[PDB]
């Protein structure tokens, strides 16, 4: 009884994430590449500042 | 609710010595460094002494420094001024200021009713305040003006200068601490800033219990110096 | 009878939404960012070492202000941290030592505080009185608290070991959502930068994307073979890494619904118990069972650094909202900031 | 000639470096390991301590002394570098004592030790240490010529003048050395029966030999290192020239060699300062 | 270089400092233990003094026992909160033979887990009364559960306790062998078993922890000082 | 997408032999240590067998110790227990179990009732 109640709600959610608009992984990519660099720049981890504006020197 | 009662002000004899208690209640004592801060009856705020918490750390203004001895019992929520050889110069009303001190503190930001005490008859940062008294209304912008003889920017960002509001009648309250942060309950028409020197307490949309006098206060390295006062008064 | 046909029809649409997942994988993003440049050998150095935690540190959340840090150690300690002068600006007494979470606010104002004792403790930071005091203590969960997160002041998500995550309502003290779904214990919590939406990964091997609001788990993704211990979005909001117990970092995106990359080395055996994004998202570091922190080129898969100053197992990372310092929480009572 | 000169001064330079480092290493792997910041390693910083002003101080000018044949530093110098040594070894061996009643009480008293184990306590005990060393050598040495009213040591040579006197000989000698290491051979005894007596307990319980090397290397070292001096002093003390001087010197030297071992024998029978010494000999 | 307010924020911190240095010498004065065991093991009444925490002291010594009964059956992610005490309190219904298998394997899987290898496991094998009850009624046999129990012999080396019947020795010295090979299979001698047979009426139980404790901090010194 | 899938069950006489299989998918199949646990109408989960990740250390639990055999196929990514005179005792649900983390000997939750890295269970009735 409960295993069917909880398959119920397990098909119910896999009908929500079935019925969703899904984008290309290349498109994915493409924009998380675009975020990369267009943030590389102010990344401080990537490029390391100056220790003159790095407070933990 | 947070309190600081004092006790042990009276006429005193010159040369003779008056111990000052300051009872708190409401708050983690221990956890406070605490602050006595005398106010002369022809004069504006002056700081005395400043115990840590802790008691590790004991500052003294070089008027007092000898004479007055400054103690606290965490267990008991009492803070003491122990002072002896008193002068006429001391003829003062004295607060009871608690002060926290760690990264986006409020210090100063009580200060006890204070007690009167009467008695019968070089290095420091300079506190400038151009003006004394400005003629001021209901509704009207007003900024009050303070200088600094030392640039109160520090090397860490923080520029200590503290802005505060003494009704008449009342104990004085912390308004802006460190040059631009609002204290708790004060206000958003309340604004501070400043370039290191020259500083200004911006104050929009006047009501009348924003009167009394404002006194500016640096932190930046002991002794503390208060600013002369700027008084505002109704029409 | 019922049972069955019901098995057969999630599987069925497990194969479907399989099938729609390798229909939008034209092209993966090993082969889109192989002609970018490789970020070199990330090499940062300890610039602070955060002492006076007294037994293991679990969790350490950054403040917004990049500066402040709160720090989780199962001493009964909720430490805050000036991390720039180590100066220890709080030291907060837990009523339950078993503590396997802290958050700390945005505004500023406010800690969390889980574990073993199933409650969400928020602590007030700013009161008058002048110490850190219990706000309220969240008390619905029936499972460890693993992980929660403030969105304001007054609402926070915690992810929870019975297989739950809830939203709260502080002032009230009541779970305003309850997200239901997950299968093993949830053991990590990241909020979306908008905070519409927050993953969640458990020991189900899956992620799940939900909705803060309409309160349903939008997506699932697998993908991983053991618990999801670490979970971070990437700093659009698009994207996040999860970390889990397979030695594998994962990204998935949202909007493809499926793994992008495989963060893995084949030295590296143990399991990942935390990740977290640079501030442009490239570097992905993440936090180990072998007592290091390998920074992980996010594009190309390519171990950048090692953070590797930890005598004993990192449980926590946090990187700063300016990007400028990674904070490694570890079990040998140490906070070692790097950049 | 020279081949014997060069050979023993790359032999002390050797052994000299090796303490030397061993004890600074020992210092360094404190203070930059917090596993190691416990209370019984305040012991063997103390211990180290002794040993770092014997491998700097005692070791070579001592070899200074042999190699030139004379003293060439003046008599309060020598009065004061023989302070200096006797001092430092005796605080040495009662590092070790304090050591080995440390291990003792932490080895037949686990649980209720801890409660003892205290930074106060640890402090006092390594001032006590190092207070009792100071009072056993320290005046006697600098003051016997003002007791006895002359200078028996030549000019030439640097020893202490009360080694000729029998009654004191004996009783700082076996204050020094003899007390100290028949307490701590006991302790030790006692710590393998106690490990013998966990293992039959164990094997009892649960229905079913490193640590006698370790005991006896750490016994051994001492006795070695410091059985022959103090065996040819007591010789010295009623035969004033029974003992060769080439034996003197080698026995006077021998003593210096447990400040090398104590190091191992010590701080690197712990992991972790196996650990922190690995790391900090790569930087 | 340090401000008014920065070094007075340093004093907070070397005050918050202090607190903690003595806060940490007032929980190391304690023994941290993991209370674990089954439901039918009896793991409340083993110390006759969602996290039941019992206190108790032996010989002046402080002990801390940590009971988790607020969690679900899943414990791979909350166990390793324990990494750090002293030992782990184990309590097995020894005359259960049909979960007795169910508490092997909860043991093998507390000795062999990565956070978990350093501790030493207090097993407490409870409820031997009802095991002696059991072997003496002849109804429920251990081989039924446990075949190699047939070819088990009590070891001629061994010391039987008085008053026992050889088929309770025989089972009681099985079952602990059965944990005892479990302990001994792995771990290198890093972290040891201590096994106790355990009635619901024992009052002995605080001092057996406080005994195995004794040993397992003394195993920690000489591993300390290289003697093992 | 870590799934198993129990086969080779159904009905069975008593003293009859039965061969169970585990196709399992979504996971490096070699390395992880991998489970047998079964479920009797009205009883717990309870473990029936283990084998390591190279097919070198197998454990049985004792009521079927000399009557169950556990193999795994690594090339294959499935898992075997060849069962063999069984006993109306051994009426159960049998579900293929993998050991929550890989290269590891502990293996805990196996035995728990929501338990992730568990398949849906196959029936063998005796
Ligand atoms: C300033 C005093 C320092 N000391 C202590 O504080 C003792 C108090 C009693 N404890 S004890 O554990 O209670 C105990 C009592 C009786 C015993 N008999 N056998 C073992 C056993 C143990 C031991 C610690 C001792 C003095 C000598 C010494 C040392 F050279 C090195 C280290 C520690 C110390
Ligand atoms: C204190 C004591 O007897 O020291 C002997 C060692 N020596 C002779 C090298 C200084």
Redo the contacts between chains.
Sequence with gaps: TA??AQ?????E??????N??????????????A??????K?????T??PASE???? | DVQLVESGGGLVQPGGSRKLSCSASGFAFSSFGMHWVRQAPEKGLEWVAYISSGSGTIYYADTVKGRFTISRDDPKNTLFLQMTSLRSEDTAMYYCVRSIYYYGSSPFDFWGQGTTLTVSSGSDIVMTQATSSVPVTPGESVSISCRSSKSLLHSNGNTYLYWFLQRPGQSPQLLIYRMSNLASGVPDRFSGSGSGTAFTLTISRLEAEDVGVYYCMQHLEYPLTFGAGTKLELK | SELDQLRQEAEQLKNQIRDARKACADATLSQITNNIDPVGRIQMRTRRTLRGHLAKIYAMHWGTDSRLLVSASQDGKLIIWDSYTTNKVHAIPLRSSWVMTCAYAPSGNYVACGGLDNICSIYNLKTREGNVRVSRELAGHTGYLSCCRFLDDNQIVTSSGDTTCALWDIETGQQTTTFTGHTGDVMSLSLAPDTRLFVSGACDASAKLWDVREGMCRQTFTGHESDINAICFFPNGNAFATGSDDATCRLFDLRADQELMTYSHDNIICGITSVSFSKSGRLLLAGYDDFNCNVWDALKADRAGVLAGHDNRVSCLGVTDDGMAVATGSWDSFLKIWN | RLWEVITIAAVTAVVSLITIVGNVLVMISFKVNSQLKTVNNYYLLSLACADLIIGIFSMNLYTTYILMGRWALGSLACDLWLALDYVASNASVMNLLVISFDRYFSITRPLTYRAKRTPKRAGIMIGLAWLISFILWAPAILCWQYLVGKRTVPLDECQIQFLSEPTITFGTAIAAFYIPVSVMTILYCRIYRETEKRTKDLADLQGSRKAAQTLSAILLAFIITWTPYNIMVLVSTFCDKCVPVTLWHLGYWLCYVNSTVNPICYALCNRTFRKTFKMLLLC | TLSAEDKAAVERSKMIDRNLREDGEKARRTLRLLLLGADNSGKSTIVKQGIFETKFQVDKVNFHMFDVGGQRDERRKWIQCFNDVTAIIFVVDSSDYNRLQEALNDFKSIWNNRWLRTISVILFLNKQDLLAEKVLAGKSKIEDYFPEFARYTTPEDATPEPGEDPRVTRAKYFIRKEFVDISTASGDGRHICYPHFTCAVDTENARRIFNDCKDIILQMNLREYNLV | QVQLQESGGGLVQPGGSLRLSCAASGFTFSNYKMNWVRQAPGKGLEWVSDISQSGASISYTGSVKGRFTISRDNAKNTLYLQMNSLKPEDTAVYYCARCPAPFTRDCFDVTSTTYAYRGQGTQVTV
């Design positions: 295993s069917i398959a119920r709600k397990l098909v959610q896999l009908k929500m994430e079935a969703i608009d899904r984008i290309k992984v290349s498109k994915a990519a493409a924009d998380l590449m975020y990369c660099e267009a943030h590389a102010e990344d401080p981890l990537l390391p500042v790095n407070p933990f020197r």
